[PDB]
Design a protein around this ligand. Structure first.
Ligand SMILES: [Zn+2]
Lengths: 14, 297
């Protein structure tokens, strides 16, 4: 939710 | 908003690239543009089986790295700049630069093949970091280490420990769980205000927030996907908020600016060059550059 700037996968959650 | 392509095809894109409106092009590139160089797509024989991970994705995770950095550094020795020569796709972006069409290239890759291909730092946004600079893990230290210092350890199978606080030293590569560089966000704000064409090459858009870049393009900006499969049709997840829009639309009845070209990137770029009349220039550029690379040895 608050971690947009963080490298992630394409999950629609945190 | 406005439809700028008279046809939703590669021919339609090429024809548009030669129009007066097509002044500024932005490239989003992933792992698929380096496969033909010898660099496998780890996200798609198992190249990771030799490391005995709990799961293949672990090798790119910051939390696993801080405890077990050995698998990554072994992979880093393979990915290191100099072990590979840029592809036709890379040199296609070089042609975009020399003809004054390339506004920016955003890359998910950490092979630095764009740099070797002739793309300068200003032309480049390396979303997932670089091997050219390394920092200490300790927040109390955070000592910077040069490329040569980092290069010596990696090729000698020695885990790079800090020379001050003896802590671990990692290359400025963005692992999962780590924050992207500031340049990424400051560039995405201004670059997508004036982009005339989006070239998405060699990525299935599986990594965020890189995948979200496609939603920043203006509504009339055509977007060409050169990839082994169709991608980006789902919610771009900009700002980790859904419903904002910006997803690819190739096949629906409402499609107007998105074109998908399915296949390998090298063939995709060759086809596009053939239509543009850059076929001979492109082939010459590749062979000339590869000869210059071998000249160093
Ligand atoms: Zn240190």
């Amino acid at each position: 939710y608050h971690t947009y700037h963080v490298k992630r996968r394409t999950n629609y959650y945190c | 908003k406005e439809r700028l392509l008279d046809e939703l095809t590669l021919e339609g894109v090429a024809r548009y690239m030669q129009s007066e409106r097509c002044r500024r092009v932005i490239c989003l590139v992933g792992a698929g543009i380096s496969t033909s160089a010898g660099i496998p797509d780890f996200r798609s024989y198992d190249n990771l089986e030799k490391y005995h991970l709990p799961y293949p994705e672990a090798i790119f995770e910051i939390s696993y790295f801080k405890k077990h950095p050995e698998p990554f550094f072994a992979l880093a020795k393979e990915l290191y700049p100099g072990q590979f020569k840029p592809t036709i796709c890379h040199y296609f972006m070089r042609l975009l630069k020399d003809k004054g069409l390339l506004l920016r290239c955003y890359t998910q890759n950490i092979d630095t093949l764009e740099r070797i291909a002739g793309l300068e730092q200003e032309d480049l946004v390396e979303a997932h970091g670089t091997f050219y600079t390394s920092h200490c893990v300790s927040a109390s230290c955070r000592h910077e280490y040069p490329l040569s210092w980092m290069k010596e350890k990696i090729f000698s199978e020695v885990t790079p420990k800090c020379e001050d606080c003896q802590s671990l030293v990692k290359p400025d590569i963005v692992f999962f769980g780590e924050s992207l560089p500031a340049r990424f966000f400051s560039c995405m704000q201004s670059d997508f205000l004036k982009v005339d064409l989006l070239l998405v090459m060699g990525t299935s858009l599986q990594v965020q927030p890189f995948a979200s870049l496609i939603s920043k393009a203006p509504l009339s900006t055509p977007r060409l996907l050169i990839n082994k499969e169709k991608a980006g049709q789902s919610d771009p997840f900009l700002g980790m908020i859904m419903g904002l829009g910006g997803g690819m639309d190739f096949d629906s009845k409402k499609a107007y600016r998105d074109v998908a070209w399915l296949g390998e990137c090298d063939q995709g770029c060759l086809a596009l060059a053939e239509l543009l009349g850059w076929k001979k220039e492109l082939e010459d550029l590749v062979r000339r550059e590869h000869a210059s690379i071998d000249a160093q040895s």
